[PDB]
């Protein structure tokens, strides 16, 4: 299993504009378009993004190309963040996937906010971190996806995804 197959399971694929769990305008593999209420402000973002007139609908390829971009962006933002970088560096290969997962979903600023959890992950206190991570809006809103991610950090295996 790898980072792409993991996110594809957590986010799903959709070829038509839709609203995310928070109510935002999204498309493809969890690509957020706009936090704006307007379907028009969404269609326009979408055309800029693809380089064509989409009229709210894209192909598989287009969907995957956006996904490639977003994963890369997520990885580079982690390596550029003074708070994230060190954590990532301290982690093994699986766990590293788990942090990329939170970052793709919640943004760098967001995860950079889990000060305590970050500190415990760095210290390799797995069980403690799993417990602290659950005390968050994140976990309360998307509990099953949170659980999957959290098990990945606790265990270091891909069990929750198999």
> Which residues carry a binding-site annotation for substrate?
32, 104, 117, 132
In whole angstroms, the minimum distance from the beta carbon of 101 to Cl ion comes to: 13
Residue closer to Cl ion, measured from CB, 46 or 111: 111
Asked if 144 interacts with Cl ion (CB under 5 A), we say yes
Paired tokens of 23? 């109510």
- Between 9 and 38, how does the x/- string for binding to Cl ion read (CB under 5 A)? ------------------------------
Asked if 142 interacts with Cl ion (CB under 5 A), we say yes
Asked if 40 interacts with Cl ion (CB under 5 A), we say no
Going by the annotation, the residues of the binding site are: 32, 104, 117, 132
Catalytic residues: 11, 20
Phi, psi of 146 (to 5 degrees): -50, -50
Residue closer to Cl ion, measured from CB, 66 or 133: 133
Which residues, 41 to 60, sit near Cl ion by CB under 5 A?
none
Which residues, 111 to 140, sit near Cl ion by CB under 5 A?
135
Paired tokens of 21? 């769990």
In whole angstroms, the minimum distance from the beta carbon of 20 to Cl ion comes to: 12
Question: What is the number of helices (H) and of strands (E) in the chain?
Answer: 9, 3
Q: Cβ distance 25 to 42 under 8 Å?
A: yes
Q: For residue 30, how many C-alpha atoms fall within 13 Å in the half-sphere facing its CB?
A: 21
Residue closer to Cl ion, measured from CB, 121 or 150: 150
Q: Distance (Å, rounded) from C-alpha 113 to C-alpha 53?
A: 37
Beta strands in 20-153 (DSSP E): 25-28, 31-34
158: nearest Cα among 86, 112, 116, 101: 101
Residue from the set 96, 145, 148, 154 that interacts with Cl ion by CB under 5 A:
145
Q: Cβ distance 96 to 88 under 8 Å?
A: yes
User: Which stretches of the chain bind Cl ion, using CB under 5 A?
Assistant: 135, 142, 144-145
């Amino acid at each position: 299993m790898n980072i792409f197959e993991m996110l594809r399971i957590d986010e799903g694929l959709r070829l038509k504009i839709y609203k995310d769990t928070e109510g935002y305008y999204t498309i493809g593999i969890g690509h957020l378009l706009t936090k704006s209420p307007s379907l028009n402000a969404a269609k326009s973002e979408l055309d800029k993004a693809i380089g064509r007139n989409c009229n709210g609908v894209i192909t598989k390829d287009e969907a995957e190309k956006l996904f490639n971009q977003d994963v890369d962006a997520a990885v580079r933002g982690i390596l550029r963040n003074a708070k994230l970088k060190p954590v990532y560096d301290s982690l093994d290969a699986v766990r590293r996937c788990a942090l990329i997962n939170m970052v793709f979903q919640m943004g760098e600023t967001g995860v950079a906010g889990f000060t305590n959890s970050l500190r415990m992950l760095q210290q390799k206190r797995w069980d403690e971190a799993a417990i602290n991570l659950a005390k968050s809006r994140w976990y309360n809103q998307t509990p099953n996806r949170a659980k999957r991610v959290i098990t990945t950090f606790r265990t270091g295996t891909w069990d929750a995804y198999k």
